[model samples]
Target: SEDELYRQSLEIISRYLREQATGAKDTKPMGRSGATSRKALETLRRVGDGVQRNHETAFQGMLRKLDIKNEDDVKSLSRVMIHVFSDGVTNWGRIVTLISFGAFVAKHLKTINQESCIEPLAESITDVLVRTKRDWLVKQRGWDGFVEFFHVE
Candidate 1:
């Protein structure tokens, strides 16, 4: 159940972000874990909004320095995500930070007319999370845990 939920949530987030980057109108997609995926997306959007509110300039500064221009350039971000997780304090908050940072990069790619890179960037994020944090994610009950963490009153 946890594996399926996590897999579905990853697809949901990647498609949602891809649509946002490309200015595509939103449409719902359902799966066995649809409800969980919906909540997962809510958490991502909330955390990503907070990231934009507080760290937009920092993100801009870092991306400007990176000068990422092509699909291949997205590879560097996986390394960066790995570095972010290497602090020996891996947790959902840090995962959320990495996802939100990817959102910023996706938007930047769109602005620079490199929208095609967004898919590869999304894949990079998925790779980093799965390769680096899959155990933690499964132990935490995947996106269900994310929704619980960010649940509103």
Candidate 2:
């Protein structure tokens, strides 16, 4: 239950950060001035705390299964988890997709601005869609299977 709550919190916080990062607002202003905003900083800290707690809990659970000793072993496993699960490649894809989408939206920016308040909503939707597509592609490509293809022994 605690782990699930932490995972959900991390997801929400991550979505918020991604939306804030890519929204129509200028990056410099958002990062420098708005970065200090209490709400923004609070969400960042919440995400960080959730991630740390989740990682610790997951590491402990795995260690218990293996009858492992020492936090360093857990820490090593955590590092492998990070490396294997991190979305570095998927993020690059999202960045390129966002740039293309932003350019397309920019063409209709004036019309959309006059008609509806969709920028924030569009940003959030795009972020989720891109991430989902990236994840699905990874799964379909058997990226996770590759890890199991190699034997530690």
Candidate 3:
């Protein structure tokens, strides 16, 4: 039921935004010389405010659905932590794919290693891996908890 409500709210807000963007071709009618200008503005403002409130409510509902009580709870959820780490790996995969394509193009054109490409690529990949690991550790353990756990010297 909550999911259905969230879907309906999202749909209504999307349609409202699309219609507003399309229908407001000229600001003069709604701004300077229109009989229903005040009523239309008020209606649109109310709709916009409603959409904002609904979005916040939907986010909170989704958090509740995930059994998360707070940020601490998020850190405690092993599965969510794993998913976040996995997302980092997925992002790195995209970067690697792009870099490999660039390398291929360079080789084909006989311009390969004209610059220090391999070293830079290796450093960038290593940086991403190190950062991902550090970020995952911090986020999963809670920054304070991680510090306490390791007793940073």
lDDT of 1 by residue, 1-153 (tens): 356644675686587568657767367665677777777776677677698669888988988987889976788767767887654576887777778778888888889899888877877787778777777878887878778877642
Which residue runs does candidate 1 get wrong by more than 4 Å?
Answer: 1-6
Write down the worst ten-residue block by lDDT for model 1: 1-10
lDDT, each prediction = 0.75, 0.35, 0.34
Candidate 1 to truth, TM = 0.87
The candidate, 2 or 3, that scores higher on TM-score is 2
lDDT of 3 by residue, 69-151 (tens): 33343234334434544465533233223223222222322232233232233233333333445554335432233224334
lDDT of 1 at 152: 45
Give lDDT: candidate 1, residue 16.
59
TM-score of 2: 0.24
Instruction: Give residue 63's lDDT in candidate 3 (0 to 100).
Output: 39
**Candidate 2, superposed: residue stretches over 4 Å from native:** 1-91, 112-115, 126-153
Q: Residues 21-131, candidate 2: write the lDDT tens digits.
A: 344322323222232233433433344335434465553454355332333333353344334434344543333233333222332333434212224323443344334
